[PDB]
Amino acid sequence: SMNPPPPETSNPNKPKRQTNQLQYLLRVVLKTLWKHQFAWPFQQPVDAVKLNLPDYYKIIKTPMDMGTIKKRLENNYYWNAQECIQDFNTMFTNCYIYNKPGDDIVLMAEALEKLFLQKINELPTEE
Ligand SMILES: COc1ccc(S(=O)(=O)N2CCCCC2)cc1NC(=O)c1[nH]c(C)c2c1CCCCC2=O
């Protein structure tokens, strides 16, 4: 019935780098989704205690949210752009696992995912 700890946003043992693709993911992809009309349900981990959703973390074992992704990018947690893209896709996948067609949260996820795909399809080349 408790929330899990949020996903780690730094691993002090991992090497760190900046790349044009990671810059794109933070400054173009995440930033565009973050200011979207439908961003607010996805800006932080699902708080299953405050929202009284005790089955959420019984169903969702790989939680992910844009707040975690944003912190991961700002902390240089990701070495490969693919790692971050996987996290965005996990976030959307979780929403479709837990919810149903026609749900408000699903219509919001679909709109955000459409925008995510438009931006990720312009990911710059590997410098
Ligand atoms: C009724 O839902 C809410 C009511 C109020 C607020 S809040 O922004 O006022 N605030 C959030 C931070 C803590 C204080 C309250 C947010 C929500 N929900 C969500 O954020 C959310 N986000 C997701 C991904 C999902 C959900 C819930 C629907 C099913 C599971 C799911 O998939």
- Enter the resolution in angstroms: 1.5
Residue type, 62: T
Is 70:30 a contact under the CB 8 Å cutoff? yes
Query: Is residue 94 a part of any domain in this protein?
Result: yes
- Range of the structural domain that residue 52 is part of: 19-123
The candidate with the shortest Cα–Cα distance to 66, out of 85, 91, 47, is 91
Query: Is residue 14 a part of any domain in this protein?
Result: no
Query: Is residue 79 a part of any domain in this protein?
Result: yes
Query: Is residue 48 a part of any domain in this protein?
Result: yes
Distance 35 CA to ligand 1 centre (A): 17
Please state the atom number of ligand 1 nearest to the C-alpha of residue 56.
Answer: 30
Query: Is residue 92 a part of any domain in this protein?
Result: yes
CA distance 85 to 108: 19
Q: What is the DSSP letter of 46?
A: -
Query: Is residue 78 a part of any domain in this protein?
Result: yes
The candidate with the shortest Cα–Cα distance to 7, out of 101, 86, 119, 106, is 86
CA distance 67 to 78: 14
Tell me which residue has its CA closest to atom 6 in ligand 1: 41
Is 16:49 a contact under the CB 8 Å cutoff? no
CA distance 54 to 104: 20
Is 78:72 a contact under the CB 8 Å cutoff? yes
Query: Is residue 95 a part of any domain in this protein?
Result: yes
Could you tell me the sign of the dihedral formed by the alpha carbons of 69, 64, 108, 124, in that order?
Answer: positive
Tell me which residue has its CA closest to atom 4 in ligand 1: 51
- Helix runs in 30-103, H state only: 31-34, 56-59, 66-74, 81-98
* Count of domains for the chain: 1
Query: Is residue 67 a part of any domain in this protein?
Result: yes
